[PDB]
Amino acid sequence: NAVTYPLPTDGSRLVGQNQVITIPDDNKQPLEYFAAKYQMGLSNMLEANPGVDTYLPKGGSVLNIPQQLILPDTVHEGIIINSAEMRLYYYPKGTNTVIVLPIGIGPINWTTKVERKKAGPTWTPTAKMHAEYAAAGNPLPAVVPAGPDNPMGLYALYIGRLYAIHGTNANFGIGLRVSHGCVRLRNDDIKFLFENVPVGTRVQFIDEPVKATTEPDGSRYIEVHNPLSTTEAQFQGGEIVPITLTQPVQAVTSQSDVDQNVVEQAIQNRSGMPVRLN
């Protein structure tokens, strides 16, 4: 599996390899189709592919698949969710691997755990949402039954304070900020988590749009994504969205052998793909 990585045991955090594919000349598929095929988020695909058309990637163009990544600076235990890059990292007890799955969101810094998990979850809408639907004339049960029309999809992991990691019955959404729901995954991905994550697993939410590492061979890398709150205009350069380097990131990026032109280009581009600094 391209998104299951053996974990390095020497302190390395750079894992994986990028791919590049060619879009057929006769292509009719939107970007979401490629993102799903490669288990990527839509925003990650946009970041890695400047000017790509989400409606219809240009036939005969090339598409970068950003499967190389730096592991976030956290414990290598349980589930880590980094909303700024729309990724969920799972460090299973049963293996020495990390599985990296794309998510959609609708929590920034919080440590919790999986309290329970359910095949075929029921959805209990908010009193708010019901008020809105009822005025619109839309029927909304107090309890939406499990099944194919349930917006949590076919599996859920509950994590406390109301929240869940769940599926979706929609055709898009993973790698996007939406309204409603907590963390959503594509069908096969949520099923995989449901089958493999025990109740009691640690869950930690972080917000780290920039990651950097000094690896054991002395090489240094940065990876820059758009910050969580980024709008279309900030994305495309009609507005700016500011990125500040945290001190852990500076521990790498301020080193004496770093090419600061690579840092500045990385910060401007926000490509989502690791770039070597030295």
Coordinates of C-alpha atoms in Angstrom, one line a residue:
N1 CA 0.0 0.0 0.0
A2 CA 1.5 3.4 -1.1
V3 CA 0.2 5.1 2.2
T4 CA 1.5 2.4 4.7
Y5 CA 5.1 3.3 5.5
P6 CA 7.6 1.3 7.5
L7 CA 8.7 3.4 10.4
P8 CA 12.3 4.3 10.6
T9 CA 14.0 3.3 13.8
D10 CA 16.9 5.7 13.7
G11 CA 14.9 9.0 14.2
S12 CA 14.3 9.7 10.5
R13 CA 11.0 11.4 9.8
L14 CA 11.1 11.5 6.0
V15 CA 9.0 8.7 4.6
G16 CA 7.6 7.7 1.2
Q17 CA 8.2 8.6 -2.4
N18 CA 6.3 10.9 -4.7
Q19 CA 4.8 9.7 -8.0
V20 CA 4.0 11.6 -11.1
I21 CA 1.3 10.4 -13.5
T22 CA 0.1 11.5 -16.9
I23 CA -3.6 12.4 -17.3
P24 CA -5.0 10.6 -20.4
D25 CA -5.6 13.0 -23.4
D26 CA -9.3 11.8 -23.4
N27 CA -9.7 12.5 -19.7
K28 CA -13.3 13.2 -18.4
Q29 CA -12.6 12.8 -14.6
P30 CA -12.5 15.6 -12.1
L31 CA -9.5 15.9 -9.7
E32 CA -11.4 14.1 -6.9
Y33 CA -11.2 11.0 -9.0
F34 CA -7.4 11.0 -9.0
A35 CA -7.2 12.0 -5.4
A36 CA -9.4 9.0 -4.4
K37 CA -7.4 6.6 -6.6
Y38 CA -4.2 7.6 -4.8
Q39 CA -5.6 8.1 -1.3
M40 CA -4.8 11.8 -1.3
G41 CA -6.8 14.8 -0.1
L42 CA -8.2 17.3 -2.6
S43 CA -6.3 20.2 -1.0
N44 CA -3.0 18.2 -1.1
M45 CA -3.5 17.6 -4.8
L46 CA -4.1 21.3 -5.4
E47 CA -1.0 22.2 -3.4
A48 CA 1.2 19.9 -5.3
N49 CA -0.2 20.8 -8.7
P50 CA -0.2 24.7 -9.3
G51 CA -3.0 25.7 -11.7
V52 CA -4.5 22.2 -11.9
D53 CA -8.3 22.3 -12.9
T54 CA -10.4 20.7 -10.2
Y55 CA -13.3 20.4 -12.6
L56 CA -11.3 18.5 -15.3
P57 CA -7.5 18.0 -15.1
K58 CA -6.2 18.8 -18.6
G59 CA -5.7 15.7 -20.8
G60 CA -2.0 15.1 -21.4
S61 CA -0.9 17.2 -18.4
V62 CA 1.2 15.6 -15.6
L63 CA 0.0 15.3 -12.0
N64 CA 2.2 15.1 -9.0
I65 CA 1.0 12.6 -6.2
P66 CA 2.6 13.9 -2.9
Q67 CA 3.1 10.5 -1.1
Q68 CA 6.5 11.6 0.3
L69 CA 6.1 13.3 3.7
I70 CA 7.7 14.3 7.0
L71 CA 6.1 12.7 10.0
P72 CA 4.7 15.2 12.4
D73 CA 6.8 15.8 15.6
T74 CA 4.7 13.8 18.0
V75 CA 4.8 10.5 19.7
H76 CA 4.6 7.5 17.4
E77 CA 1.6 6.1 19.1
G78 CA -2.1 5.9 18.3
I79 CA -3.8 8.4 16.0
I80 CA -2.4 11.8 15.1
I81 CA -4.6 14.2 13.2
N82 CA -3.0 17.2 11.5
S83 CA -5.9 19.3 10.2
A84 CA -3.5 21.8 8.5
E85 CA -2.5 19.0 6.0
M86 CA -5.7 17.1 6.1
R87 CA -4.0 13.9 7.3
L88 CA -4.6 11.3 9.9
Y89 CA -1.5 9.2 10.9
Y90 CA -2.1 5.8 12.6
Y91 CA 0.7 4.1 14.5
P92 CA -0.7 0.6 15.1
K93 CA 0.3 -1.5 18.1
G94 CA 0.5 -4.6 15.9
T95 CA 3.1 -3.3 13.4
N96 CA 6.1 -1.0 13.2
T97 CA 4.4 1.0 10.4
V98 CA 2.5 4.2 10.0
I99 CA -0.6 4.5 7.9
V100 CA -1.4 7.9 6.5
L101 CA -5.0 8.6 5.4
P102 CA -6.6 11.7 3.9
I103 CA -9.4 13.4 5.9
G104 CA -12.0 16.1 5.6
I105 CA -12.9 18.3 8.6
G106 CA -15.7 20.5 9.8
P107 CA -10.3 20.7 17.1
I108 CA -6.9 22.2 16.9
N109 CA -4.9 20.9 19.9
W110 CA -6.4 18.2 22.1
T111 CA -5.5 14.7 23.2
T112 CA -8.3 12.2 23.7
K113 CA -8.9 8.5 22.9
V114 CA -11.2 6.2 21.0
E115 CA -14.1 5.6 23.4
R116 CA -16.2 3.2 21.2
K117 CA -16.6 2.2 17.7
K118 CA -19.7 1.3 15.7
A119 CA -20.4 -0.4 12.4
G120 CA -23.5 1.2 11.1
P121 CA -23.6 4.4 13.2
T122 CA -26.8 6.4 13.7
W123 CA -26.6 10.1 13.3
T124 CA -28.1 12.4 16.0
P125 CA -28.5 15.9 14.4
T126 CA -28.1 19.0 16.6
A127 CA -31.0 20.8 17.9
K128 CA -29.8 23.7 15.8
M129 CA -29.6 21.9 12.6
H130 CA -33.1 20.5 13.2
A131 CA -34.5 24.0 13.8
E132 CA -33.1 25.1 10.5
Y133 CA -34.3 22.1 8.5
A134 CA -37.8 22.2 10.1
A135 CA -38.3 25.9 9.0
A136 CA -37.0 24.9 5.4
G137 CA -39.7 22.1 5.4
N138 CA -37.0 19.4 5.3
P139 CA -38.0 16.2 7.3
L140 CA -35.2 15.5 9.9
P141 CA -35.5 12.8 12.4
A142 CA -34.1 13.2 15.9
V143 CA -32.2 10.0 15.0
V144 CA -31.1 9.3 11.5
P145 CA -30.8 5.5 11.0
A146 CA -27.7 3.6 10.0
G147 CA -27.4 2.9 6.3
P148 CA -26.5 4.3 2.9
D149 CA -28.0 7.8 3.4
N150 CA -26.5 8.4 6.8
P151 CA -24.0 11.2 6.5
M152 CA -21.5 9.5 8.9
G153 CA -21.1 6.8 6.5
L154 CA -20.9 3.1 7.5
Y155 CA -18.4 3.2 10.3
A156 CA -17.5 5.5 13.2
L157 CA -14.9 5.8 16.0
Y158 CA -16.1 8.0 18.8
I159 CA -13.5 10.1 20.7
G160 CA -15.4 12.1 23.3
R161 CA -16.8 15.6 23.8
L162 CA -19.3 14.6 21.1
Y163 CA -16.7 14.1 18.3
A164 CA -16.2 11.1 16.0
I165 CA -13.9 10.0 13.1
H166 CA -16.4 8.7 10.5
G167 CA -17.2 8.1 6.9
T168 CA -19.4 10.0 4.4
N169 CA -22.0 9.2 1.9
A170 CA -20.9 12.1 -0.4
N171 CA -18.8 12.1 -3.5
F172 CA -16.3 14.7 -2.4
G173 CA -15.1 16.3 0.8
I174 CA -11.9 14.5 1.9
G175 CA -9.1 17.1 1.9
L176 CA -11.7 20.0 2.2
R177 CA -13.0 22.0 5.1
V178 CA -16.8 21.5 5.2
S179 CA -19.7 22.3 7.4
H180 CA -21.0 19.5 9.7
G181 CA -19.3 16.4 10.9
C182 CA -16.0 16.1 12.7
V183 CA -13.3 14.1 10.8
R184 CA -14.5 12.3 7.7
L185 CA -12.8 9.6 5.6
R186 CA -13.5 7.8 2.3
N187 CA -15.3 4.5 2.4
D188 CA -12.4 2.1 2.3
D189 CA -10.3 4.2 4.6
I190 CA -12.9 4.5 7.4
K191 CA -13.5 0.8 7.1
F192 CA -9.8 0.0 7.4
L193 CA -9.6 2.2 10.6
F194 CA -12.7 0.6 12.0
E195 CA -11.2 -2.9 11.5
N196 CA -7.8 -1.9 12.9
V197 CA -8.1 0.6 15.6
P198 CA -8.9 -0.8 19.1
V199 CA -11.0 1.0 21.6
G200 CA -8.8 3.0 24.0
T201 CA -6.3 4.1 21.2
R202 CA -4.8 7.6 21.9
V203 CA -6.0 10.4 19.6
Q204 CA -4.2 13.7 19.3
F205 CA -5.1 16.7 17.2
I206 CA -2.4 19.1 16.1
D207 CA -2.3 22.1 13.8
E208 CA 1.1 22.1 12.0
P209 CA 1.2 23.5 8.5
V210 CA 5.0 23.4 8.4
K211 CA 7.1 20.4 9.4
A212 CA 10.9 20.1 9.3
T213 CA 13.4 17.5 10.1
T214 CA 17.2 17.0 10.4
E215 CA 17.7 13.4 9.5
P216 CA 20.4 11.0 10.8
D217 CA 22.6 11.5 7.7
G218 CA 22.6 15.3 8.3
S219 CA 20.2 16.1 5.5
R220 CA 17.5 18.6 6.3
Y221 CA 14.0 18.9 4.9
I222 CA 11.0 21.3 5.1
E223 CA 7.3 20.6 4.1
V224 CA 4.9 23.5 3.9
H225 CA 1.1 23.4 3.5
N226 CA -1.4 26.1 3.5
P227 CA -2.5 27.0 7.0
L228 CA -5.8 25.6 8.2
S229 CA -7.8 28.9 7.8
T230 CA -6.8 29.4 4.2
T231 CA -9.3 30.8 1.7
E232 CA -9.5 30.3 -2.1
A233 CA -8.0 33.8 -2.6
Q234 CA -5.2 33.2 -0.1
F235 CA -4.6 29.8 -1.9
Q236 CA -4.4 31.4 -5.4
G237 CA -2.5 34.5 -4.3
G238 CA -5.3 37.1 -4.5
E239 CA -4.7 37.6 -0.7
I240 CA -1.8 36.5 1.5
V241 CA -2.1 33.9 4.4
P242 CA 0.8 34.3 6.8
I243 CA 2.9 31.4 7.8
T244 CA 5.1 31.7 10.9
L245 CA 7.9 29.2 11.7
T246 CA 7.5 27.7 15.1
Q247 CA 10.6 27.2 17.2
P248 CA 10.7 23.4 16.6
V249 CA 10.7 24.2 12.9
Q250 CA 13.4 26.8 13.3
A251 CA 15.5 24.2 15.1
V252 CA 16.0 22.9 11.6
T253 CA 15.4 25.9 9.3
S254 CA 17.9 28.3 11.1
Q255 CA 20.8 25.9 10.9
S256 CA 23.9 27.3 9.3
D257 CA 24.0 25.0 6.2
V258 CA 20.3 25.7 5.2
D259 CA 19.7 27.4 1.8
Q260 CA 17.3 30.2 2.9
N261 CA 16.1 30.6 -0.7
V262 CA 14.7 27.1 -0.5
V263 CA 13.0 28.0 2.7
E264 CA 11.5 31.2 1.3
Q265 CA 10.4 29.5 -2.0
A266 CA 8.9 26.7 0.1
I267 CA 7.0 29.2 2.2
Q268 CA 5.7 31.0 -0.9
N269 CA 4.8 27.9 -2.9
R270 CA 3.1 25.8 -0.2
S271 CA 3.4 22.7 -2.3
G272 CA 2.9 20.2 0.5
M273 CA 6.0 18.1 -0.6
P274 CA 9.2 17.8 1.4
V275 CA 12.1 19.8 -0.1
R276 CA 15.7 19.3 0.9
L277 CA 17.3 22.4 2.6
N278 CA 20.9 21.6 2.6

